[PDB]
Design a protein around this ligand. Structure first.
Ligand SMILES: O=c1ccn([C@@H]2O[C@H](COP(=O)(O)OP(=O)(O)OP(=O)(O)O)[C@@H](O)[C@H]2O)c(=O)[nH]1
Ligand SMILES: O=c1ccn([C@@H]2O[C@H](COP(=O)(O)OP(=O)(O)OP(=O)(O)O)[C@@H](O)[C@H]2O)c(=O)[nH]1
Ligand SMILES: O=C(O)C[C@H](NC(=O)CP(=O)(O)O)C(=O)O
Ligand SMILES: O=C(O)C[C@H](NC(=O)CP(=O)(O)O)C(=O)O
Ligand SMILES: O=C(O)C[C@H](NC(=O)CP(=O)(O)O)C(=O)O
Ligand SMILES: [Zn+2]
Ligand SMILES: [Zn+2]
Lengths: 143, 310, 143, 310, 310
């Protein structure tokens, strides 16, 4: 239990490590505590990430909806939970993903990647801001 | 200011039906009553990073008919991007300190969108970005469909050939979907089919479309038969089986065609339209090409002149 | 705080996360507890990884030596440190390293990399089984 | 059997002084008393993946002088590795089912070592692997030094030119360091210096070496002057300033040489040895080349025969 | 004399079961008891007009193991056909005045047959002609099957990969069809299917074959699993979608195999057999290659000697 910062609770299994990798959460001097494969109650098994002295905007919290929709984000101060929130699907995913169209201008030029997000038939479709092609989020890779 | 004053023209997906009708109305006006000095004191860049005949020459002709000056290049090989390794971003960052608008064609999808992020207050007009969009083609296409059918709603429209890489059909299908009651027939090899983002868009809007294996199936129904070239320069070698036109239209296939039916093709054609079609009253691809002058004059007017024309 | 398993202590800062990637440690269903940027009496800051019911492969502790020489590996059973040890620097490291000599045959062909490792002056010199070139391990750090 | 029977010959680093002496004594006897049927019923692969004149032709001649047959290639371009994408590993895996030994030269460092992992019981002889090792060159080199100097101890040896990429001098320096009291003079451009791993070996054996910027500095002291070609096919483009020989030996530079001194060069030379050197008593690069026959015969006889009796 | 004395070896279609059995029995004896002077005073041409590793090197090694000499070329580029415009006909007309037999591989179908019309009394051995025939591959193939399975009858044989352009499987299927009760499984992309002329032959002999879209469908039933490379150098550009192996064998696919099953591949492999297959008891492509020596020795001995006595 931390004094101040953020606790990302109810992360599904095998997702916690990916979130660390993807949003580069370990690139800081702040104390981080990670529980993986912990027992839950509402979920059975879960992952858990606590980061001291670090806060997530609503947009940052929304970026998690892609990987942990049912996650809980506790903002914490003076050992107290002073705010709780849930990922709601965001309108855009910027920077972290790589457009899978090999002929897109985003690969050759000094811009950040950017995709519009939409629900499509129990899948999430990503539409590249630049080349406007659309992909299953499954086939849009990270970096 | 008119709705399109100082606007970037990148994708049909960003334009409303009212925008499209505005271009068309302006096109009619300047065709009837040319304003040879409307764009005097404008200097416009024409930057083509891949090949063009119609789009570049009609655009530059349009600029001159409106009194504007033109600078640019038809080939990137002798720009500093071609020989010194400069990015496209830096290229746009400098050119946008020179001119009043940038017309650009480029072999990578999204190049035009990118340019807008570096052109500051200078509008970018997309003359084609890879297999993505071709919004000025659509504008002349719409003008042509209007001219010959008298309307843009409740039409039967067949699109034939390479629908996957046809930036023309991506833009045109999106544009026609903004009108009511239009019906689509897609005649393509499976490997070059219309992309799912286009079909999804249609389904969402409740528009009727169907896949067909032949021109003859739909010939009796169609008002517009839009033929395309296989985009061989876009093909993955895995798709090289499709280089040759799978569907060839000849004069003989036009027997049961409606008297209103026009054959369109954004050009160039290879063999998908036989020369014997040229002489038939259904042939309208050259008329169509000529209409690019009026669509492109109109677009330039609306982007560079704040007042609606008369 | 576990019952049976492994505790890798005294991992230097910003290395803990790099160890989880390489050793695929989070690809288990076993409970894992990770502390990053933990305070240390000996080191000031350190990282720490606990894996229940799991022990390292001998290559992993061999691999552990160059990443984190000062690291400490504790074996635990019945909540007791039944085994504690410092990574022994072997003489041979196979499979995970990439020769920095771009003209080395090991790049083009289906063989496992293999290096002879020895302490040299200040750093560690790593000598390729194939091209017979020797490198500071700082050069083999990135690949 | 003899110590070298059925052994791979990959690197000087895996050979002892006794091994090198064995090849030399065997080479002396074969030069004196030839054994034309020694390798009868042997078939040996000669597989060159980069250019060669001396190494391949002396090797194949040696096989023939001993009565063996030869198969292989001088270019990889018409092998299945060259046209059908086959790995070197699979290539060695199948050729090792045909022949009694494999002679291989290859542009990548390590290729000969790799080959041993796929050749099973078939000995591999390294005719050169990238800029790494050239053990048979060293064998003939040592043989030539022994012949002209009467010894392999207490020599003064200058090595000149491209020492970084010279697989010749990597192997030769390692060999001469297995003997006592040798002294080395390294005359090389700073960008093409002798590699540190060689120097470290010299240090941990307490062997004296020094760097010099001129042949003149050492001419009066050397027993062997070993000239090298700049290995341009191995240079990084950042090293293209060194493409031209930095040190050019001509006949006039030899005025203060020891009478017994010999000029060696593994060959080919470009400009580092002027042709006016050829007629002097010091020139010995062609005699050295000639000695490839006896060293390579010697090595083959020792690897493919359990025992030899003079 | 023996049935094959002075015979051209062009196509499996011209050979009887008895002929194939003769080469196999002869190959078994030569493997057991070698005849190093069998072809003494013979000179044989090895003329490869396209790439080869196994076929050319095993062939030349075989000639040498039998005591014959070898002349020829591995590339046609420095022949007078390559530089002075000479026909293949004139080329064969003159080489047939020099040698006792001609081994030829060529990129056009029919070249070996054509050669026989110009070679007079000099036997021609087809080392591969375009995508048509590969009779010596089949000889070693049959030898390997016989060795591992104890028979050439009542086998279950899967052939996988590029069957359209695979001269290997054209010849092998024709050969195995001369034996009784064999059953075939053809696993191939539809564009690279087994040619109809092969299937027609199977039909008119009442031989069971079937098509399958997966190795797993047949793994538990097959005695021989014969993998092939996609022959990219023969593909029409319309067939470039098939350039990549469609079926990839790895060690895990072998869990339900018959214990006696062997994985064959005429080689080279690209990706159709993963390297983790190599260490399993089923991998037998290198042993198969090895057998090229005994089949090719056998064929040479039978064509150039009237009679052989073990
Ligand atoms: O620092 C730590 C270490 C471990 N844990 C562990 O987190 C787990 C959560 O235990 P909790 O009591 O916090 O919640 P819960 O399981 O009862 O209900 P849900 O979260 O499923 O809604 C427990 O296993 C606890 O040991 C922390 O919460 N913080
Ligand atoms: O199992 C553990 C061990 C240690 N820690 C955390 O590590 C911190 C260090 O407390 P420790 O007692 O474990 O180490 P140390 O201070 O003696 O320093 P070293 O010389 O051993 O490196 C403590 O503040 C605690 O938060 C854990 O959270 N869990
Ligand atoms: O190239 C085509 O087939 C259609 C279309 N054609 C044109 O715009 C005409 P042009 O290339 O001569 O300017 C295009 O997408 O570029
Ligand atoms: O090429 C050199 O300069 C030295 C050396 N030269 C030789 O081996 C002689 P060749 O290349 O003619 O066989 C080599 O490493 O290949
Ligand atoms: O090339 C193949 O894939 C099969 C077959 N392979 C061989 O004959 C082996 P090689 O080409 O090395 O002589 C051929 O037809 O050439
Ligand atoms: Zn994109
Ligand atoms: Zn290496």
């Amino acid at each position: 239990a931390i004094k101040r910062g953020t606790v990302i609770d109810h992360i599904p299994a095998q997702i916690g490590f990916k979130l660390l990798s993807l949003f580069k959460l370990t690139e800081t001097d702040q104390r981080i505590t990670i529980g993986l494969n912990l027992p839950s109650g509402e979920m059975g098994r879960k992952d858990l990430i606590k980061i001291e002295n670090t806060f997530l905007s609503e947009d940052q919290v929304d970026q998690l909806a892609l990987y942990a929709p049912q996650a809980t984000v506790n903002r914490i101060d003076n050992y107290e939970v002073v705010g709780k929130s849930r990922p709601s699907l965001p309108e855009r995913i910027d920077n972290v993903l790589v457009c899978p169209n090999s002929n897109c201008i985003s690969h050759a030029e000094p811009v950040s990647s950017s995709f519009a997000v939409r629900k499509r038939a129990n899948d999430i479709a990503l539409k590249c801001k630049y080349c406007e092609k659309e992909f299953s989020h499954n086939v849009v890779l990270a970096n | 200011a008119n709705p399109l004053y100082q606007k970037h023209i990148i994708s049909i997906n960003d334009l409303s039906r009212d925008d499209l009708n505005l271009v068309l109305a302006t096109a009619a006006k300047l065709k009837a009553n040319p304003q040879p000095e409307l764009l005097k004191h404008k200097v416009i860049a024409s930057c083509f990073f891949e090949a063009s005949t119609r789009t570049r020459l009609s655009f530059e002709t349009s600029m001159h008919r409106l009194g504007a000056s033109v600078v640019g290049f038809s080939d990137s090989a002798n720009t500093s991007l071609g020989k010194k390794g400069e990015t496209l971003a830096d290229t746009i960052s400098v050119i946008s300190t020179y001119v009043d608008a940038i017309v650009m064609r480029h072999p990578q999808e999204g190049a035009a969108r990118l340019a807008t992020e570096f052109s500051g207050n200078v509008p970018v007009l997309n003359a084609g970005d890879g297999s993505n969009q071709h919004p000025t083609q659509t504008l002349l296409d719409l003008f042509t469909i209007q001219e010959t059918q008298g309307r843009l709603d409740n039409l039967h429209v067949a699109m034939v050939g390479d629908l996957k890489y046809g930036r023309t059909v991506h833009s045109l299908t999106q544009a026609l979907a903004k009108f009511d009651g239009n019906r689509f027939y897609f005649i393509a090899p499976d490997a070059l089919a219309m992309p799912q983002y286009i079909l999804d868009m249609l389904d969402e809007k409740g528009i009727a479309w169907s896949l067909h294996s032949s021109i003859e199936e739909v010939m009796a129904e169609v008002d517009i038969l839009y033929m395309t070239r296989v985009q061989k320069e876009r093909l993955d070698p895995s798709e090289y089986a499709n280089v040759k036109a799978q569907f060839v239209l000849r004069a003989s296939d036009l027997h049961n065609a409606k008297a209103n039916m026009k054959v369109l093709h954004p050009l160039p054609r290879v063999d998908e339209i036989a020369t014997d079609v040229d002489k038939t009253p259904h042939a309208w691809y050259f008329q169509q090409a000529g209409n690019g002058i009026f669509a492109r004059q109109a677009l330039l007017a609306l982007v560079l002149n704040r007042d609606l024309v008369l």
